[PDB]
Amino acid sequence: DHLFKVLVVGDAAVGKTSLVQRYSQDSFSKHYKSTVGVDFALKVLQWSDYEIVRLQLWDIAGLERFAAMTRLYYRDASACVIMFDVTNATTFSNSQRWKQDLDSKLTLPNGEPVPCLLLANKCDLSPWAVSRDQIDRFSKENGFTGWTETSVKENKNINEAMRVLIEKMMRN
Amino acid sequence: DEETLKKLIVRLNNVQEGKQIETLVQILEDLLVFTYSEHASKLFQGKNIHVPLLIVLDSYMRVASVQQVGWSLLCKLIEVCPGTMQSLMGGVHQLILKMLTVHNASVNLSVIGLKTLDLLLTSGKITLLILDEESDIFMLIFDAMANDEVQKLGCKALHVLFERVSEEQLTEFVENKDYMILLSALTNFKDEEEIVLHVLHCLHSLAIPCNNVEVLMSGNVRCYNIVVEAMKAFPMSERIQEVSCCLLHRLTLGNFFNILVLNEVHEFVVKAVQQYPENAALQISALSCLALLTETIFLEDKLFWLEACYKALTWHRKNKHVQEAACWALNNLLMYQNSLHEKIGDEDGHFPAHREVMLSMLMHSSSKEVFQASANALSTLLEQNVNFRKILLSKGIHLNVLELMQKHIHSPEVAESGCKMLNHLFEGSNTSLDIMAAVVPKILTVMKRHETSLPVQLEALRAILHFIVEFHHKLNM
Ligand SMILES: Nc1nc2c(ncn2[C@@H]2O[C@H](COP(=O)(O)OP(=O)(O)NP(=O)(O)O)[C@H](O)[C@H]2O)c(=O)[nH]1
Ligand SMILES: [Mg+2]
């Protein structure tokens, strides 16, 4: 058995908790609210026989983006993910900022960058929904471990993307 | 321009007539004080400009002119020349202390000497020379004290002399020195904010030894004067309140039963934390002081304390000490007042101090003190309100603290607090076999590692008792 910590970061009002409630508390859609501070969730996965893994999801509040993103949150962290809404290019620039900040202020025992995944949130909304051609530019330029479309309300691809990301994380 | 200055400094080396040299020095001082250029700071920094002047002043002590203007000249030179302090060291302290000793009994001669001493002591590495002299600098300044500038300069000085006089030196000082300041100036300059600041922090510096608290509490003079200063002198001054607060924090002991004064200082502390919540300046000292004094007092205000603690955690997440003191204060308040159990929580109108405490624990695993205080706090919170049970459990507290006690094992207090927190968390709940396998071995190893300590054994046994009691096949393993 093992335990791990994953930090969810992104822009404001993108429904960060929605995804973390869907994956752990089995709560999807719901009202749109503002996350004042850092909140926690627990996940248990039976990845293999006699090998059960625990995950601590920390959904960092993105309201204070201009404020110094303290390394204490990323301290002892084992994984991270950037999730941005697909209705704003400002969210895309914010995701680039999160990528730069984590690359600057995150370390691993082996020294290699920890896996990162580009989550295209709530794709089930018009009009900028399936613009994967534009997303591929940053997908290959940023050197991210993965990229995958998702919809928090519908939970269309949260589970497969999370499984791929966690399999990549234990692959290291 | 510089040619005249060269002529003046050349004439200064003659040392022929005292009156003529005095007039030349006065003219040079008058010309040097200007904003035209840095000609006076011509980077020469020659001691020949001022070392013969101080030699003449020391040798011919009756010459009041060189005493009156040479100190002003060197003060202006230091205020103008940037590297003058660098030219001081790498002596002059002996010269200035002899100047203060032999013939500085006049007010005009004293004030310039004390001002020069005050500005010189802002450089550093010269205080050791000042404290190792033969002129009895402490006796000199004590004999100096009765004019306002003298006092505001008597303090702003001494402030640094108390850094290493000796705990014993302070003890000798407590017998007679306190009067030459507390009596001498707090009453006298009651309307001098900087003087009050210097006096209060000098009291702070002398309050280091433990034996002197009885002397400071001989007639409750320290408590009364600091309370009056906080109430009247500084309604809206951060530095005064911070210094008085640090006095409050360092003046808490077995004699805390200053009931009426207790109430007073409690109120003042609240005022402080409500009027400057932006730095460690007040938060840490007041919260620790407040926690002990609230325990003593309780044997409204509680809501204000909850709010102050919540902002204390919110605005100073990066400092271990602030969070430790704040969560300790929250614990000590909640221990004596359980009515506010519903007043705290995730709901609107209630401070979400739970997630903040947990975040503190995670972000400062390296310190045992923060873990101890925050663990005790949230354990008392969980014992107070049953609703919070199984919510932190669903939030990832159990295996997380198990890993923390795995990381921190060399101390018994951390293990005892962890076992108590597990006991009060897992009470009234039923777990699965996986939770059993994830909990029982780690706590058993912790109990084995600390076998001698009775409280750890008691808490561990209580936790195991509350936690022990297809499916049958798994349970057998
Ligand atoms: N258009 C649209 N809105 C959705 C969909 N699913 C959820 N939402 C809305 O988006 C909202 C986001 O609110 P919330 O999760 O509280 O935001 P947050 O990102 O956690 N706040 P913070 O940025 O501070 O972390 C709610 O999830 C819901 O009202 C969807 O498929 N489409
Ligand atoms: Mg959120």
Numbering used by the authors:
A (entry chain B): 5 to 176
B (entry chain E): 12 to 101, 113 to 167, 172 to 325, 344 to 513, 525 to 532
Verbatim from the authors:
Mutations in the LRRK2 gene, which encodes the leucine-rich repeat kinase 2 (LRRK2) protein, are among the most frequent genetic causes of late-onset PD and account for ~5% of familial and ~1% of sporadic cases. Most LRRK2-related PD mutations, such as G2019S (Gly2019→Ser), have increased kinase activity. Previous studies have suggested an emerging “Rab29–LRRK2–Rabs” cascade for LRRK2 signaling, in which GTP-bound Rab29 (Rab29•GTP) facilitates LRRK2 membrane recruitment and activation, then activated LRRK2 phosphorylates Rab GTPases, including Rab29 itself.
We determined cryo–electron microscopy (cryo-EM) structures of the Rab29–LRRK2 complex, reconstituted by mixing LRRK2, Rab29EM, GTP analog (GppNHp), adenosine triphosphate (ATP), and Mg2+. We thus introduced three point mutations (Q67L, T71A, and S72A) to Rab29 (Rab29EM) to maximize the opportunity of capturing the active Rab29•GTP–LRRK2 complex (where Q is glutamine, L is leucine, T is threonine, A is alanine, and S is serine). T71A and S72A prevent Rab29 phosphorylation, and Q67L abolishes GTPase activity and enhances the interaction between Rab29 and LRRK2 (26). The interaction conforms with a general Rab-effector recognition mode, in which effectors associate with the GTP-bound form of Rabs through the Switch I-Interswitch-Switch II surface. The surfaces of Rab29 and Rab10 predicted to interact with LRRK2 had almost identical interface residues, which is consistent with previous work suggesting that Rab10 interacts with LRRK2 at the Rab29 site. We also assessed the effect of interface mutations on LRRK2 kinase activity in cells by monitoring the phosphorylation status of Rab10-Thr73, Rab29-Thr71, and LRRK2-Ser1292 (28). All mutations introduced to the Rab29–LRRK2 interface had minor impacts on the basal activity of LRRK2 on Rab10 and Ser1292, supporting the view that the observed interface is important for LRRK2 recruitment but probably not for substrate recognition.
